[PDB]
Amino acid sequence: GRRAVRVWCDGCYDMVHYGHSNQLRQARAMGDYLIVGVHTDEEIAKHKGPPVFTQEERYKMVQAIKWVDEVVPAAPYVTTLETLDKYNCDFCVHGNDITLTVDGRDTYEEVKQAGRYRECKRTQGVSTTDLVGRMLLVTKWTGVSQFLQTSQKIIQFASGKEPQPGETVIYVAGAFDLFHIGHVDFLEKVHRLAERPYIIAGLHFDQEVNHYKGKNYPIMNLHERTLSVLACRYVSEVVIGAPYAVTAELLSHFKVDLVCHGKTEIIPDRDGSDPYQEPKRRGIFRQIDSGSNLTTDLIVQRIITN
Numbered sequence: 001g002r003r004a005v006r007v008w009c010d011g012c013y014d015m016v017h018y019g020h021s022n023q024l025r026q027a028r029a030m031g032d033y034l035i036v037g038v039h040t041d042e043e044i045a046k047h048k049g050p051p052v053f054t055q056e057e058r059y060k061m062v063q064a065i066k067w068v069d070e071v072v073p074a075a076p077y078v079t080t081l082e083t084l085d086k087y088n089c090d091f092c093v094h095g096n097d098i099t100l101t102v103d104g105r106d107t108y109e110e111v112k113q114a115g116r117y118r119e120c121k122r123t124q125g126v127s128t129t130d131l132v133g134r135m136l137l138v139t140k141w142t143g144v145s146q147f148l149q150t151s152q153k154i155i156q157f158a159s160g161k162e163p164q165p166g167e168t169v170i171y172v173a174g175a176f177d178l179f180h181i182g183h184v185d186f187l188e189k190v191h192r193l194a195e196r197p198y199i200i201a202g203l204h205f206d207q208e209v210n211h212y213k214g215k216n217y218p219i220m221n222l223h224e225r226t227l228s229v230l231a232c233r234y235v236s237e238v239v240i241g242a243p244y245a246v247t248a249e250l251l252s253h254f255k256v257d258l259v260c261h262g263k264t265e266i267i268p269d270r271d272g273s274d275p276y277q278e279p280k281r282r283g284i285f286r287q288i289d290s291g292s293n294l295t296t297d298l299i300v301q302r303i304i305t306n
């Protein structure tokens with residue numbers, strides 16, 4: 001038995017994207033166990049403006065990412081040894097920003113001098129601001145994203161497991177754009193539908209999403225959406241470019257036991273047909289209620305306050 005390295009992060013985690021998730025993956029790789037501190041609405045307000053998502057929304061999203069072992073709510077804004085000592089955490093991990101006080105001293109001086117501060121690289125291809133811009137475009141399809149996808153980035157995000165005997169294969173599908181607490185609440189309930197679930201998430205092509213969603217959607221592209229969704233602990237695997245209709249070929253290919261959709265509107269397939277007709281014919285379709293009303297369109301409207 002080796003001695004366990006417990007690891008700390010903190011931040012606002014306000015509108016979580018695959019950069020947040022890649023930093024948490026990276027931080028968790030540095031030890032055995034990741035704890036994450038998230039600040040309150042009130043606390044974020046004192047330093048920046050108030051955040052787009054409420055604390056309990058933010059606590060829940062972070063908790064949903066597979067590298068995170070626990071979420072400490074109302075974490076202080078600035079990391080301290082008092083906090084590290086209090087959660088038995090060997091060291092903290094931040095991305096490499098310039099973090100200086102007004103007089104030129106380091107915000108994390110205490111921690112750095114104690115030898116208890118580690119850095120990870122910033123994730124390429126994304127930031128909340130970049131995303132704010134993508135939303136502004138949509139409200140006022142060839143591709144505004146310059147994320148560079150690789151096999152290695154997918155290897156790092158994927159759990160990498162084939163369905164074992166006894167596991168109940170469950171397929172779901174959609175846009176999964178701006179992967180959010182609504183999708184998490186949906187997937188987390190789907191995950192209750194069996195003892196040992198193996199959830200596969202079909203991700204519609206960008207061209208398809210633009211067609212059925214109008215405008216400049218999707219905000220995120222298939223590759224980005226791939227990682228967003230693989231970061232979720234309830235997901236075992238992803239179809240990267242799934243058809244809109246849940247075909248026979250697909251169900252048979254993945255040996256699907258079960259198919260779900262949430263309480264959102266199902267838009268008819270181009271020929272008028274129910275794209276879930278085939279699993280309903282087999283009697284393996286089941287509708288689920290997430291309990292969330294959150295959609296990509298509501299995230300846009302909450303994120304633009306002018």
Ligand SMILES: Nc1ccn([C@@H]2O[C@H](COP(=O)(O)OP(=O)(O)OP(=O)(O)O)[C@@H](O)[C@H]2O)c(=O)n1
Pocket residue numbers: 010011012013014019020023094095096097121122123124126127128129
């Ligand atoms: N593409 C990005 C964006 C952010 N982060 C890291 O995530 C850390 C903690 O997250 P948090 O403070 O809660 O959010 P932001 O950093 O504001 O996210 P962003 O820059 O995208 O707005 C940040 O220091 C940031 O460097 C990262 O690694 N890669």
Ligand SMILES: Nc1ccn([C@@H]2O[C@H](COP(=O)(O)O)[C@@H](O)[C@H]2O)c(=O)n1
Pocket residue numbers: 172173174175176177182183186260261262263264265288289290292293294295
């Ligand atoms: N708030 C939400 C958002 C999505 N969902 C479900 O998540 C899946 C993917 O949704 P999108 O294709 O709309 O991203 C769908 O089955 C949808 O019904 C939900 O149950 N509650």
